[PDB]
Design an enzyme around this catalytic site. Structure first.
Site, PDB file in Angstrom:
ATOM      1  N   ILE A  38       0.979  -1.415  -0.255  1.00 35.67           N
ATOM      2  CA  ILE A  38       0.539   0.131   0.161  1.00 35.67           C
ATOM      3  C   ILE A  38       0.699   1.332   0.028  1.00 35.67           C
ATOM      4  O   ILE A  38       0.355   1.741  -0.520  1.00 35.67           O
ATOM      5  CB  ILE A  38      -0.748  -0.397   1.078  1.00 35.67           C
ATOM      6  CG1 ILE A  38       0.274   0.461   2.497  1.00 35.67           C
ATOM      7  CG2 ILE A  38      -1.812  -1.378   1.674  1.00 35.67           C
ATOM      8  CD1 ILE A  38      -0.775   0.005   3.990  1.00 35.67           C
ATOM      9  N   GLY A  39       1.859   1.238   0.490  1.00 38.92           N
ATOM     10  CA  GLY A  39       2.539   2.632   0.907  1.00 38.92           C
ATOM     11  C   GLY A  39       4.325   2.413   0.669  1.00 38.92           C
ATOM     12  O   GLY A  39       4.587   1.469   0.626  1.00 38.92           O
ATOM     13  N   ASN A  40       4.661   3.379  -0.243  1.00 41.11           N
ATOM     14  CA  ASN A  40       6.415   3.234  -0.410  1.00 41.11           C
ATOM     15  C   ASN A  40       6.679   4.777   0.182  1.00 41.11           C
ATOM     16  O   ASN A  40       7.829   5.363  -0.051  1.00 41.11           O
ATOM     17  CB  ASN A  40       6.233   3.299  -1.917  1.00 41.11           C
ATOM     18  CG  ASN A  40       7.696   3.196  -2.255  1.00 41.11           C
ATOM     19  OD1 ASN A  40       9.021   3.862  -1.789  1.00 41.11           O
ATOM     20  ND2 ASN A  40       8.067   1.406  -2.623  1.00 41.11           N
ATOM     21  N   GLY A  41       7.090   5.536   1.664  1.00 37.07           N
ATOM     22  CA  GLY A  41       8.246   5.887   2.465  1.00 37.07           C
ATOM     23  C   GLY A  41       8.464   5.851   1.340  1.00 37.07           C
ATOM     24  O   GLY A  41       9.221   5.803   0.573  1.00 37.07           O
ATOM     25  N   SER A  42       9.645   6.931   2.455  1.00 39.48           N
ATOM     26  CA  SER A  42      11.317   6.399   2.197  1.00 39.48           C
ATOM     27  C   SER A  42      12.219   6.267   2.287  1.00 39.48           C
ATOM     28  O   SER A  42      12.741   5.091   1.437  1.00 39.48           O
ATOM     29  CB  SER A  42      11.346   8.840   2.132  1.00 39.48           C
ATOM     30  OG  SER A  42      10.876   9.606   3.209  1.00 39.48           O
ATOM     31  N   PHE A  43      12.283   5.888   4.075  1.00 37.84           N
ATOM     32  CA  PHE A  43      12.993   4.953   4.585  1.00 37.84           C
ATOM     33  C   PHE A  43      12.887   3.416   3.862  1.00 37.84           C
ATOM     34  O   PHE A  43      13.775   2.540   4.609  1.00 37.84           O
ATOM     35  CB  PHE A  43      12.957   5.451   6.350  1.00 37.84           C
ATOM     36  CG  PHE A  43      12.915   7.038   6.673  1.00 37.84           C
ATOM     37  CD1 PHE A  43      11.999   7.630   6.265  1.00 37.84           C
ATOM     38  CD2 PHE A  43      14.480   7.315   7.246  1.00 37.84           C
ATOM     39  CE1 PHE A  43      12.631   8.944   6.240  1.00 37.84           C
ATOM     40  CE2 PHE A  43      14.897   8.059   7.184  1.00 37.84           C
ATOM     41  CZ  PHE A  43      13.904   9.611   6.541  1.00 37.84           C
ATOM     42  N   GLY A  44      11.275   3.644   4.377  1.00 35.80           N
ATOM     43  CA  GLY A  44      11.360   1.663   3.726  1.00 35.80           C
ATOM     44  C   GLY A  44       9.953   2.006   2.811  1.00 35.80           C
ATOM     45  O   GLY A  44       9.645   2.398   2.170  1.00 35.80           O
ATOM     46  N   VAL A  46       5.820   0.402   3.418  1.00 36.21           N
ATOM     47  CA  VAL A  46       4.593   0.483   4.471  1.00 36.21           C
ATOM     48  C   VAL A  46       3.547  -0.801   3.319  1.00 36.21           C
ATOM     49  O   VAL A  46       3.010  -0.514   2.833  1.00 36.21           O
ATOM     50  CB  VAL A  46       4.011   1.568   4.277  1.00 36.21           C
ATOM     51  CG1 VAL A  46       2.746   1.699   4.997  1.00 36.21           C
ATOM     52  CG2 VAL A  46       4.728   2.537   5.255  1.00 36.21           C
ATOM     53  N   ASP A 150       6.491  15.746  12.950  1.00 39.95           N
ATOM     54  CA  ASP A 150       6.004  16.108  12.045  1.00 39.95           C
ATOM     55  C   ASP A 150       4.094  15.912  11.950  1.00 39.95           C
ATOM     56  O   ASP A 150       3.878  14.686  11.291  1.00 39.95           O
ATOM     57  CB  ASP A 150       6.796  14.935  11.262  1.00 39.95           C
ATOM     58  CG  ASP A 150       6.291  15.078   9.754  1.00 39.95           C
ATOM     59  OD1 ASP A 150       5.574  15.808   8.744  1.00 39.95           O
ATOM     60  OD2 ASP A 150       6.694  13.663   8.903  1.00 39.95           O
TER      61      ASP A 150
END
EC number: 2.7.11.26
Length: 338
Positions: A38-44, A46, A150
């Protein structure tokens, strides 16, 4: 490690032994299915998944764990237990680190956007509900000296029916210690406190309050209140409303014609007491909670347009009220004392 079998009517099953988010280290067999990136943040990465037993939907944030040191997010979340912060169900390692968190489909961002596109506006009741819960979540983590850093509409998860909000994404959280300096490039654009903009490194956790005031103001306006492609631009907008800063106001660093008409004057008041040049003049999370703007929430007859009851809002703790215990005389309403 993790074992991945495929039983129970054509379905991939991932089994692994993880550690409870909170409590004593007592490993367990956790089996989930339907893992979708579902997600692709930056650090890793999701991941979103389904627990085979309860059927509950969890989220898995896989970030590149390193042995060079402890994982601050994991550490911080390992010590948080509040009805307004995403829950860390479990955590485990893969060949790197995985964070199994509660899964929540909607976010304040998405909701505010929906209404904003339809040239409509969110009923203040939700504004009050959401903002209140965020302020409470802030009073809680602040009580441990932890600053989120944040706070933004997207990091505010919410259940559409219950109306309960949960602060998420502590990947930028840090416990602040007086004397110790901190990077000043950790906050989101439209929500960075002037100090962060001025590059201060001695900021206090009250930068979370500024951001919150920005979320609030945005909810009432239908768009961010201090946008800008650059700091210079952002400051312009900040000044256009707060007024030019005095020399003192700056040193400490490092309305009536703003919101739409017919907009509660309590809401406009709170905003002003949250968005102040002087970091030390901003209300504290608990003071934000006890603001008149949240009086409706204190009413005993209040309910969601839904007809359902509001989520818990008064089950405060000593931990929570520590910043100013006596505020409980306002925070905990009479009927709640029956």
């Amino acid at each position: 490690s993790m074992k991945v079998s495929r039983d129970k009517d054509g379905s991939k099953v991932t089994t692994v032994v993880a550690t409870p988010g909170q409590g004593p280290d007592r490993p367990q067999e956790v089996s989930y299915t339907d893992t979708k990136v579902i997600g692709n943040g930056s650090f890793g990465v999701v991941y979103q998944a389904k627990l085979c037993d309860s059927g509950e939907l969890v989220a898995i944030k896989k970030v590149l764990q390193d042995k060079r040191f402890k994982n601050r997010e994991l550490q911080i979340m390992r010590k948080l237990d509040h009805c307004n912060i995403v829950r860390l169900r479990y955590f485990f390692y893969s060949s790197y680190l995985n964070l199994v968190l509660d899964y929540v489909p909607e976010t304040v961002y998405r909701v505010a956007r929906h209404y904003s596109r339809a040239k409509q506006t969110l009923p203040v009741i939700y504004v009050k509900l959401y903002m209140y819960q965020l302020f409470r979540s802030l009073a809680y983590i602040h009580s441990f000296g932890i600053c989120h850093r944040d706070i933004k509409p997207q990091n505010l998860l919410l259940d559409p029916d219950t109306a309960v909000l949960k602060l998420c994404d502590f990947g930028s959280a840090k416990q602040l210690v007086r004397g110790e300096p901190n990077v000043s490039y950790i906050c989101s654009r439209y929500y960075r406190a002037p100090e962060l903009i001025f590059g201060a490194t001695d900021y206090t956790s009250s930068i979370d309050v500024w951001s919150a005031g920005c979320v609030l103001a945005e909810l009432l306006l239908g768009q961010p209140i201090f946008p800008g492609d650059s700091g210079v631009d952002q400051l312009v907008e900040i000044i256009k409303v707060l007024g030019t800063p005095t020399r003192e106001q700056i040193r400490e660093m490092n309305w009536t014609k703003v919101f739409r008409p017919r907009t509660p004057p309590e809401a406009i008041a709170l905003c002003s007491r949250l968005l102040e040049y002087t970091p030390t003049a901003r209300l504290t999370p608990l003071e934000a909670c006890a603001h008149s703007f949240f009086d409706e929430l204190r009413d005993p007859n209040v309910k969601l347009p839904n007809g359902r009851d509001t989520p818990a809002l008064f089950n405060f703790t000593t931990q929570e009220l520590s910043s100013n215990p006596p505020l409980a005389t306002i925070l905990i309403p009479p009927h709640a004392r029956i």
